[PDB]
Design an enzyme around this catalytic site. Structure first.
Site, short mmCIF file in Angstrom:
data_model
loop_
_atom_site.label_atom_id
_atom_site.label_comp_id
_atom_site.label_asym_id
_atom_site.label_seq_id
_atom_site.Cartn_x
_atom_site.Cartn_y
_atom_site.Cartn_z
N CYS A 174 0.85 -1.11 -0.03
CA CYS A 174 0.10 0.16 -0.03
C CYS A 174 0.79 1.23 0.07
O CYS A 174 1.36 1.61 1.11
CB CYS A 174 -0.95 -0.02 1.21
SG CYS A 174 -2.08 1.61 1.16
N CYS B 252 -0.37 4.32 2.22
CA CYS B 252 -0.19 4.05 3.59
C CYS B 252 1.36 4.05 3.93
O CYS B 252 1.69 4.74 4.95
CB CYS B 252 -0.32 2.42 4.00
SG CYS B 252 -1.81 1.85 3.31
N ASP B 253 2.28 3.69 3.10
CA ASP B 253 3.91 3.49 3.50
C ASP B 253 4.82 4.34 2.52
O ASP B 253 5.99 4.67 3.01
CB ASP B 253 4.11 2.11 3.26
CG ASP B 253 3.47 0.94 4.29
OD1 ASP B 253 3.26 1.78 5.26
OD2 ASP B 253 3.17 0.02 3.98
#
Ligand SMILES: Cc1cc2nc3c(=O)[nH]c(=O)nc-3n(C[C@H](O)[C@H](O)[C@H](O)COP(=O)(O)OP(=O)(O)OC[C@H]3O[C@@H](n4cnc5c(N)ncnc54)[C@H](O)[C@@H]3O)c2cc1C
Ligand SMILES: Cc1cc2nc3c(=O)[nH]c(=O)nc-3n(C[C@H](O)[C@H](O)[C@H](O)COP(=O)(O)OP(=O)(O)OC[C@H]3O[C@@H](n4cnc5c(N)ncnc54)[C@H](O)[C@@H]3O)c2cc1C
Ligand SMILES: NC(=O)c1ccc[n+]([C@@H]2O[C@H](COP(=O)([O-])OP(=O)(O)OC[C@H]3O[C@@H](n4cnc5c(N)ncnc54)[C@H](OP(=O)(O)O)[C@@H]3O)[C@@H](O)[C@H]2O)c1
Ligand SMILES: NC(=O)c1ccc[n+]([C@@H]2O[C@H](COP(=O)([O-])OP(=O)(O)OC[C@H]3O[C@@H](n4cnc5c(N)ncnc54)[C@H](OP(=O)(O)O)[C@@H]3O)[C@@H](O)[C@H]2O)c1
Lengths: 303, 303
Positions: A130, A133-134
């Site tokens: 993701c 997200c990251d």
């Protein structure tokens, strides 16, 4: 006791619930996490008609907003199982049971794993599924993206905000992504390509990823190259473990429906990505969801 | 010469065109009037996921906005006919012809007529099929709305902004509209109901409507009552005259498709309200449109 329970609050479920509630059905919408489903793991959404570009989590909030006010009952739950008793159904979560006349399954799909060495070992520490997200944990890194479809190519484009470079590794010499996104990736100077290749091993320290080994699928040539992060986008698996036993899935585990979103089991419908289908989009999730909601209404009326 | 031509720029066509253009198909979107289709004749849209309430013409503009920039070629045209030559198709408008490998028909549906005396005579002068278009011409009038479905009941609620009173006349004793809208109408003090009735005659002067004659369908009781306006919402007919000959319609004239939006004729797809179906909504128009766009892409790739 519920007229309908909808399991999952991504766009398919949230559309279904909006419609059942507008038909004044006693509506339960169960979600294990945050409303929005995959849209929350999507950075920028450009193809939802009505918005010219919108962050995934903003669209999630907008779709979730009216539900309370329409009288949908929103509740936490991880569904572990469903029982078909004939004129009612039981849904089992971790701590609860719910009885309903009908069910709409909208639980979506999940990232497929490579199943290569290092993939689990470096989960917290260089491997991600993701980007939104990251990605900012990979500032100034050489990032690798595995896959050739819409997710790989779009998420690679997003990641160029953070990485020194982003390389897309695809197992053929032509991408599967939409041509507009392909062309953007071709033109973007921070994107490189490793064509006709698959990853074989992800390597690192005790603490983090350092390199990937990969193979060219036409020649067998093996290469090892340094990367700081690897993001994997090699397709989807269904999220339908709670119905394995029920006889409504194909060999791969996708839920089988007809064109009115009906399964085998009367009163159980499925919508959106969890269904067996080829075309997974917000537009068709929404469509599916509305059609299920109408079919549920009618099923319940007949009962 | 076009990869795809989409006929009609309501939400189904506009979603189709957005998707074909994102697949870099050479895309023509023909519309006879204003982009938006029925949404422009809709006052308030509450059930499009992503917007909690939005005026129909605002949603129309928002869906139309990105099309230019994606490279859809937007053009005026009233389509009068289509010819299936095998590996290309010809589309005929009033003045032009267009050759294309595939076609997506998204031309929607139109108001059904009562077919009663006075209905044509008072067209400019008290009879309307569109509340958002005509309602403010009926300030302080006693308005009559014919029908019991979503359009009748919603448009009656809208018209209470203008009329002294609005009366809904339905041919049964239960509405077909969504329960949430029914309940709003029941509660609204400016809405009256004539149940179990149908209109028989619309009467007036040379210059305007004055009264309606109607009949109770359970007793034959005939009544005549004064009204300043009458708005008719008794259902829909397909807008598909340009394909009558082609063998792709049912007995009522709706376009028949499978679940991938394919007609008989390979390379001709149809989406949205013009298709044979029960559930006519923006959500399913959008869904249909996206699915057609994907199928067109693939058809054209195979060619
Ligand atoms: C990186 C990425 C970018 C994308 N971008 C686009 C795009 O730009 N445009 C586009 O049209 N499509 C896009 N998609 C596809 C799109 O997001 C999906 O098609 C859509 O979200 C599917 O919605 P759904 O409601 O079927 O499932 P999901 O959004 O997958 O929602 C499923 C929900 O079910 C919940 N759930 C799962 N199991 C359980 C359980 N056992 N109990 C309770 N709750 C459960 C999950 O928490 C989740 O919230 C993208 C996908 C990805 C991965
Ligand atoms: C009063 C009213 C309120 C509504 N409210 C809602 C609502 O709140 N929510 C909801 O989900 N749905 C609503 N609907 C239903 C919804 O508007 C339709 O389902 C949707 O617009 C269908 O889109 P479509 O693209 O299939 O057709 P349309 O919107 O009907 O668009 C068809 C287009 O084709 C064009 N066209 C027709 N013939 C030709 C030709 N021969 N050549 C070129 N162009 C042509 C027309 O000009 C039109 O622009 C409402 C309907 C009505 C009547
Ligand atoms: N904007 C959007 O509309 C949007 C955005 C994201 C996702 N989605 C949709 O969501 C669904 C899922 O998308 P997705 O991109 O995640 O999956 P997907 O469409 O299945 O694509 C996976 C890609 O990874 C490739 N792949 C598989 N294993 C590989 C390996 N070991 N090494 C290298 N490449 C490998 C596949 O190869 P092959 O091509 O050879 O099979 C394919 O190109 C799709 O239907 C997609 O259209 C849509
Ligand atoms: N918000 C929304 O989502 C929304 C808004 C508007 C429209 N739509 C959709 O658009 C489609 C068309 O809607 P619609 O309301 O225009 O048409 P519709 O669903 O066909 O309803 C027509 C209504 O008029 C009644 N009727 C027919 N002839 C009559 C007569 N002579 N006298 C009195 N009543 C008569 C019908 O009776 P019976 O019920 O007996 O058949 C029915 O109740 C529907 O699928 C609808 O759901 C959706």
């Amino acid at each position: 006791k519920y007229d309908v329970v909808i399991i999952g609050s991504g766009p398919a479920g949230m559309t279904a619930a909006m419609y059942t509630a507008r038909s004044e059905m006693k509506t339960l919408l169960l979600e294990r996490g945050v409303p929005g489903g995959q849209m929350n793991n999507t950075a920028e959404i450009e193809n939802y008609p009505g918005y010219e570009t919108i962050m995934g989590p903003e669209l999630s909030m907008k779709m979730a907003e009216p539900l309370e006010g329409l009288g949908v009952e929103n509740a936490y739950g991880f569904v572990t199982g469903i029982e078909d008793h004939g004129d009612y159904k039981k849904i089992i979560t971790e701590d609860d049971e719910f009885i309903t006349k009908s069910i709409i399954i909208a639980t979506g799909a999940n990232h497929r794993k490579l199943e290569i060495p290092g993939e689990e070992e470096y989960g917290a520490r260089g491997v991600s599924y993701c980007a939104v997200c990251d990605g900012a944990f990979f500032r100034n890194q050489e990032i690798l993206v595995i896959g050739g479809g819409d997710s790989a190519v779009e998420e690679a484009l997003y990641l160029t905000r953070f990485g020194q470079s982003v390389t897309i590794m695809h197992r053929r010499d032509k991408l599967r992504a939409q041509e507009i996104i392909q062309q953007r990736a071709f033109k973007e100077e921070k994107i490189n390509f490793i064509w006709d290749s698959v990853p074989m091993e992800i390597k690192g320290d005790d603490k983090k990823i350092q390199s990937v080994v990969y193979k060219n699928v036409k020649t067998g040539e093996v290469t090892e190259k340094a990367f700081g992060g690897i993001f994997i986008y090699v397709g989807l698996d269904p999220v339908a473990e709670f119905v394995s036993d029920l006889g409504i899935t194909d060999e791969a585990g996708w839920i089988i429906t007809d064109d009115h979103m009906r399964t085998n089991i009367p009163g159980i419908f499925a919508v959106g990505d969890v269904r067996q289908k080829d075309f997974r989009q917000i537009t068709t999730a929404v469509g599916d969801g509305a059609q299920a909601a109408q079919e549920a209404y009618k099923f319940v009326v007949e009962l």
